[PDB]
Symmetry: D2
Subunit: 263 residues, 4 copies
């Protein structure tokens, strides 16, 4: 017979729950040890950046209750990119919290079809669809409870990959936080791709965009990409990379993969 | 860690491809031996009723080419209900054929979210989302190439279950074909369901709707439900049931399941 | 040349703003003197039923601020039907309040295309489109802050017309409020309508549905339909009709219009 | 009372119908004398670029019948930008022809909400919503009947403005046709726009994109923008501009308007 449908299987560390880890005075890591889900607590509600796997919806709500954040207090959901391992529980979180989802046009159309018809993965990695409530332009500022979030487009991993920057505090003194999406091309066809003709040009420009980001502290959807280690608690950001080191190491791998593809 | 995502696993007979089996002068079974996918060839294009599993998209196009039906000749896609085992390849068939999808409001909203947030199954059975192009009302007539299709609402299995009736020919003499959805409640909570408060009333009315259907030849999305056997070719409709026998046997099981639920 | 686009022109009384008029301990009329927009204040947020004309968005927010209801306190928007003169400002209210919209499948698909492609009016009466966040079934209960709202389907005016019932208080003693949609067919083709084949059957059943509604106090999207007069303030409900009188008078006009159509 | 809704009123020349005007061996102007609606007839169907005002749906179908193009022969609809005066009848054309709509993400999200919530015009200019069937990336090639269409992004007038280029013939000898969107900012706030923070950068890059377009014959959604005159028939392209002259004149006006805004 025809082959059975195969689901998205990941490592066991991507689904290992952890307690809320503090990043700044209002920024908390409430995801897992290998998936970043940031919670920003303001005076007029909470903001969530990414969510992880689709089955992490209940775990995210439990950590929000640990921080004193009721479900109806979640006001907005921000996304780096609309893939299943980071925008999975968005649909379920909208129903159980009443929040809104902000994303650009490319992330909105990919989120609306549940990651299906992917430019590189096809229908292999899908998740429940969700609709975006506010369309975001490049450089637009989103304000929730006095905390301003600025969107920075960085197409490559997905056409709608977006980096979010905001200024928090660390016991009074300010700190610039940058949450940038992945800059990798896992198994992508880089040259002459019919679905993404200008893929190389968007990666090169995104490398420069990440370098110029105002950032004192960098975080990525996968903690290992920015040399974070959520398991060691207080010393999690000890070896974290800079925006230059994160972009320089990404461009060196992109050039090597682009060279091997030629051969 | 959290449990891995589990996909929809079915029997091997649901994915066993078969050659186009003739039902009438213009009606053909082009699905598998355990999944019904009807092809109606007209003078101004072709019409497809249901599709089966999501991975059956390539198999459906091959049988259409066997009948001399080009991809651009598929004009319309009709659906009984928007579940994965029967509306799976709808999204892929729209891209590769340029056809339109007609469905009622309940089937359109379930198809738009890929079967997720199901009233009884939740997110356990999902598929790539698709958007309906024409909304159909109860009793509305859809005409393609002189062949009139009449929609008959029969809510129960899904809130938007629809039966389609049309008149074909069998070597000149006419024949009334009825394609009715399933009348079963597999594992449903029948009494006091918060997601479907009037589930019992819709099943009772749907039982009467199927009995009154103008039908000389009955077909169901699952061939065993109407006692069809696609494997024996010409003698496939030898033991096929009537609309009364199909509805009477469905209501007897519904009453028994409703009685066991009380206990 | 071709004719210019003509907009939806209404009477001056439909756009005459008024102060919040109290209906019960938690129910307030915050629309205009000829358009009903109900505000239900609970302990965990506010609920809005209908909105009126699209340009009434600013007026609705001002009356909510008069009641001490911040924009972020609006939690849910309920709709009777998705026409421009009652679901107009829904799209703008979602952006400026962060609320969610609950509606059935028929109201959701009509709201998603902004009232265009109407079964009887075509594209003559349009408004900014909005997407529903929660799909509601017949008889489903929606709870906000301890106040339960029950949806009652009554198709006719639109295929997704819904009546909402809830129990409030009047200085301690309870009162059953029923917000039923219009039961009129203004200029509709009642017999043999291709877009709505079973229009007569849905009107007859909706007449009986309104009679059986649990109701001590009836309100309609147009106040004159239920003999309300918002201009006289405290004596607004003095001449209000019952559910029987409202349905009996509607069925008598429907039979007369159906008889004149035959001629 | 509140102000009445005001519709989109245009000049009488935008609604002045005209007969099919030939541009190349397969390219025809089937719109009006002041609105461009291009019809490309291939061996495997027809392609339509833009449509004009919403009320021009019937006029477009009549000219298609004059060219021997049946409604079911229209295979694809391409859009320059999703404004009412050029994407108006898209929703009605989809229902009456069965065609598909191809657009980028920005044009798809603006077309899905009927031009409402415009970045500069708000809800002042709306039209019936339509859904895109295929999402197009920058530089992607769309092939219909052996004629290849290449999309060139040129954001500015709208965030999803797209220029389409294709090679036709003029009695055997080939000719490169370029259909570029408007490069004007009518009444836009150019500096410090919250809804479009990087508006100036997108206009500057779009000016350079239009200059480098492979083009022997340039056409614009408004004929006067490229110095076309559909009224004089055969001598319509006598004074048509080049891509350089069209972009140079657009950048000179943009710099002047940007200078006056500073004052």
């Amino acid at each position: 017979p025809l082959p059975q449908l195969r689901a998205y299987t990941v490592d066991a560390s991507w689904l290992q729950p952890m307690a809320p880890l503090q990043v700044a005075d209002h920024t908390w890591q409430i995801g897992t040890e290998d998936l970043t889900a940031l919670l920003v607590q303001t005076a007029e509600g909470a903001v969530l950046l990414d969510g992880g796997m689709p089955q992490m919806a209940g775990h995210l709500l439990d950590n929000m209750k640990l921080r004193g954040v009721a479900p109806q207090d979640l006001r907005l959901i921000l996304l780096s990119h609309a893939h299943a391992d980071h925008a999975g529980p968005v649909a379920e979180l909208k129903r159980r919290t009443g929040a809104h989802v902000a994303a650009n046009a490319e992330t909105a159309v990919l989120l609306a079809r549940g990651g299906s018809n992917d430019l590189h993965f096809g229908d292999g990695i899908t998740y429940p669809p969700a609709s975006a409530d506010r369309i975001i332009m490049d450089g637009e500022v989103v304000t929730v409870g006095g905390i301003a979030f600025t969107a920075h487009f960085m197409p490559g991993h997905t056409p709608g990959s977006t980096a979010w920057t905001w200024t928090d505090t660390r016991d009074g003194k300010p700190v610039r936080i940058a949450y940038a999406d992945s800059l990798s091309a896992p198994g992508y066809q880089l040259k002459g791709n019919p679905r993404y003709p200008r893929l190389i040009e968007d990666y090169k420009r995104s490398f420069a965009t990440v370098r110029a980001l105002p950032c004192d502290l960098l975080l990525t959807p996968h903690p290992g990409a920015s040399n974070w280690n959520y398991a060691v608690g207080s010393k999690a950001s000890a070896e974290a990379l800079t925006c230059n080191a994160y972009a320089d190491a990404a461009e060196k791998k992109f050039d090597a993969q682009l060279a091997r593809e030629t051969a």
